[PDB]
């Protein structure tokens, strides 16, 4: 059935954390890397991107995105706009982009959940900026 530490939930073979306190895109994800096979948020399925929406929509007002762990390490130089990849280095095998990133000039680098979107959808983002984030790792 699953254990999770106690301040993070269960989801398929994964635990999950919500943290408040903001950091860059970078040191969200180190941070995440403090726990065993850690990194910022990987979202592989609709069911997970369902689950994880779950996990952050009682966020609260102050907050309307969210890091998770998609990057662009080409910083848009990828021809095709598909430089795009997980810190966890998940095949990216779903997709669902808020708006995709090739149709926008000068997009952010790195990737969100946004309010806007019910936390359902990703958003490109300034990855320098702040924000709370969503770790997944293993117990
Ligand atoms: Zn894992
Ligand atoms: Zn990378
Ligand atoms: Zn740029």
């Not at 269960?10 to 860059?24: D, E, M, R, T, V």
């Not at 021809?79 to 708006?99: I, L, Q």
């Amino acid at each position: 059935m699953i254990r999770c530490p106690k301040g993070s939930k269960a989801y398929g073979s994964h635990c999950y954390a919500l943290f408040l306190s903001p950091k860059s895109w970078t040191d969200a994800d180190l941070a995440c890397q403090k726990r065993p096979s850690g990194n910022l948020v990987s979202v592989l399925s609709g069911a997970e991107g369902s689950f994880v929406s779950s996990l952050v929509k009682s966020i609260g007002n102050s907050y309307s995105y969210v890091w998770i762990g998609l990057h662009d390490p080409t910083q848009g130089t990828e021809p095709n706009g598909e430089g795009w990849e997980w810190s966890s280095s998940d095949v990216m095998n779903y997709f669902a982009w808020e708006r995709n990133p090739s149709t926008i000039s000068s997009p952010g680098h790195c990737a969100s959940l946004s309010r806007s979107t019910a936390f359902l959808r990703w958003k490109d983002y300034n990855c320098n900026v702040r924000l709370p984030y969503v770790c997944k790792f293993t117990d």
